[PDB]
Amino acid sequence: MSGVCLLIDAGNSRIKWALADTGRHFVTSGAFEHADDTPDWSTLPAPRGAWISNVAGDAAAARIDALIDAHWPALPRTVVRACAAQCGVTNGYAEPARLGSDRWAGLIGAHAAFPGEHLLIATFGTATTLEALRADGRFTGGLIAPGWALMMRSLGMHTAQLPTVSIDAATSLLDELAANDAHAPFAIDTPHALSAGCLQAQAGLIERAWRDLEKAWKAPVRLVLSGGAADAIVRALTVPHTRHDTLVLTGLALIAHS
Amino acid sequence: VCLLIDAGNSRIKWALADTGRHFVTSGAFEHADDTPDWSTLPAPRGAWISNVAGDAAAARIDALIDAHWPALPRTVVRACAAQCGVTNGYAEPARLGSDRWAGLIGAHAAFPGEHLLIATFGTATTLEALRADGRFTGGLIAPGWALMMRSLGMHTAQLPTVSIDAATSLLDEAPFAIDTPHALSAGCLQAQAGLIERAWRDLEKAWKAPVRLVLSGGAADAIVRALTVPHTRHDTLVLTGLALIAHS
Numbered sequence: 001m002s003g004v005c006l007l008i009d010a011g012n013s014r015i016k017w018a019l020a021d022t023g024r025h026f027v028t029s030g031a032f033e034h035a036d037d038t039p040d041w042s043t044l045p046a047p048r049g050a051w052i053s054n055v056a057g058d059a060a061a062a063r064i065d066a067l068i069d070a071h072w073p074a075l076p077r078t079v080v081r082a083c084a085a086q087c088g089v090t091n092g093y094a095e096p097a098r099l100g101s102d103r104w105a106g107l108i109g110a111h112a113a114f115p116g117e118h119l120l121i122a123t124f125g126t127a128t129t130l131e132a133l134r135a136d137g138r139f140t141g142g143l144i145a146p147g148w149a150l151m152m153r154s155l156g157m158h159t160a161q162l163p164t165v166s167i168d169a170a171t172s173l174l175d176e177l178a179a180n181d182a183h184a185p186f187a188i189d190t191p192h193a194l195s196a197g198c199l200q201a202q203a204g205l206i207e208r209a210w211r212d213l214e215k216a217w218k219a220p221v222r223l224v225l226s227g228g229a230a231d232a233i234v235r236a237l238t239v240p241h242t243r244h245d246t247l248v249l250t251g252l253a254l255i256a257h258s
Numbered sequence: 259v260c261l262l263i264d265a266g267n268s269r270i271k272w273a274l275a276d277t278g279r280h281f282v283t284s285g286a287f288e289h290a291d292d293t294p295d296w297s298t299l300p301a302p303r304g305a306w307i308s309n310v311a312g313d314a315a316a317a318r319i320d321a322l323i324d325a326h327w328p329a330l331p332r333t334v335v336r337a338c339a340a341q342c343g344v345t346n347g348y349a350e351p352a353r354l355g356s357d358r359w360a361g362l363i364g365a366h367a368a369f370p371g372e373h374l375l376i377a378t379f380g381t382a383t384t385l386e387a388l389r390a391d392g393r394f395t396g397g398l399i400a401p402g403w404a405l406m407m408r409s410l411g412m413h414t415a416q417l418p419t420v421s422i423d424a425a426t427s428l429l430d431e432a433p434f435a436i437d438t439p440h441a442l443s444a445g446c447l448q449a450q451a452g453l454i455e456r457a458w459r460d461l462e463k464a465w466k467a468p469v470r471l472v473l474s475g476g477a478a479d480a481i482v483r484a485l486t487v488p489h490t491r492h493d494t495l496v497l498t499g500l501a502l503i504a505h506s
């Protein structure tokens with residue numbers, strides 16, 4: 001019998017995956033793009049099923065199915081969705097099912113990773129999302145903002161004079177931010193005014209939300225950060241933080257192995 | 259009198275000024291398909307135009323001026339190394355937005371002897387740091403509230419598109435949200451407030467001195483209400499800077 005589960009985290013920007021033998025451990029993992037790209041799965045040991053989080057729409061769903069079937073015909077699979085309660089977490093959304101499935105899995109991962117702690121989970125992807133998670137597993141609410149790269153693109157696409165920086169140039173500007181010292185000053189050129197402005201908006205959101213949460217809950221809150229833009233955001237942060245970049249896949253592993 | 263035009267990406271603002279410091283009247287309109295009511299205006303001696311909205315807007319503005327005052331003298335205003343007591347710290351001074359430049363000039367005149375942080379809430383949210391001695395030291399550009407919310411609706415599969423009016427009603431409706439529209443309204447608003455607050459605190463820290471935070475042009479009430487730091491509203495900074503340029 002196979003001891004491994006295939007886990008897929010399809011977001012708006014890319015598709016991440018892992019093969020998990022327990023609720024916490026991955027045998028291997030990787031990522032690919034939505035178009036003209038396919039992962040190396042012909043060397044993988046056959047999984048007992050797939051668990052799929054997809055917030056990228058029906059086209060992506062059909063494409064993921066096509067990839068799974070092209071390797072393991074009729075593999076059992078589960079389309080993961082947020083629900084009222086699962087794996088120690090209870091969903092405080094007014095309509096639990098409307099919470100993003102990625103966010104749900106991340107909550108489950110974080111609950112397991114940091115037992116007994118109040119958390120603010122910050123995940124940097126297409127969007128920047130925040131979730132407040134009590135030590136007793138109650139997800140009490142959250143916030144959504146555009147992510148750094150989306151902010152940058154929005155400015156070029158919706159003003160006459162600001163450049164729409166390319167994917168590669170945006171990556172270069174983000175990497176420059178990740179080389180900055182603390183308390184970076186303002187910029188003296190347009191591309192850096194954009195990069196720093198969008199970064200400071202990210203840092204400002206996270207710090208303001210974290211302080212608000214500690215003050216509301218009257219207890220220490222662990223700020224947990226995830227995602228590509230975290231390296232740059234950490235240079236700007238002054239508040240304590242923890243990095244955990246596998247919360248969503250861990251949550252999927254916990255669901256699969258439950 | 260001088261006609262002053264502040265054309266941004268979302269709207270064109272204007273004033274009629276009889277000095278560097280006084281407006282006979284003012285107003286605003288959208289690029290298309292609206293137009294200002296200039297029918298009851300005293301004829302101007304010339305126009306001074308800041309335009310960051312592109313060559314097309316520049317054509318609409320010209321046609322508008324020419325329709326009322328054919329071949330009226332006009333001057334396209336651009337950022338430069340130094341003007342009206344302000345010195346431009348940009349590496350390439352002319353690349354600074356002409357609106358930001360005029361706003362700096364207006365701020366230097368309006369709040370003499372003070373270090374300033376100018377926050378302008380338009381299509382983009384901009385910040386400029388301005389020393390009391392007139393040195394513009396640098397700035398930041400982020401998307402505005404509406405742009406942030408629209409970007410999420412247009413560039414994700416599942417999120418809705420929420421306007422400022424809609425978000426304002428939702429937020430008037432622990433410490434975060436339990437549904438998607440409120441989550442994005444609040445997330446984007448708190449990014450706006452957090453940006454400004456963090457920048458102001460960091461600037462006072464860096465300069466070891468008080469800094470007046472000036473909120474330039476209009477700004478959604480929800481943004482202003484959210485701020486926990488002191489601030490001063492000046493809704494006509496750019497136009498007042500244009501009046502100074504025109505009378506210089």
Ligand SMILES: CC(C)(CO)[C@@H](O)C(=O)NCCC(=O)O
Nearest residue numbers: 055098099100103127414416438
């Ligand atoms: C916010 C995103 C886009 C982040 O990937 C995703 O979690 C999503 O589509 N969520 C649905 C709306 C919500 O979580 O309130």
Ligand SMILES: CC(C)(CO)[C@@H](O)C(=O)NCCC(=O)O
Nearest residue numbers: 159161190310353354355358382
């Ligand atoms: C940032 C905006 C769009 C604000 O209107 C405008 O000032 C502009 O196009 N600026 C040019 C780039 C800069 O000021 O660095």
Ligand SMILES: [Cl-]
Nearest residue numbers: 134135136137
């Ligand atoms: Cl608790």
Ligand SMILES: [Cl-]
Nearest residue numbers: 154157408409
């Ligand atoms: Cl956009």
Ligand SMILES: [K+]
Nearest residue numbers: 156159160162
């Ligand atoms: K552009």
Ligand SMILES: [K+]
Nearest residue numbers: 411414415417
């Ligand atoms: K959408």
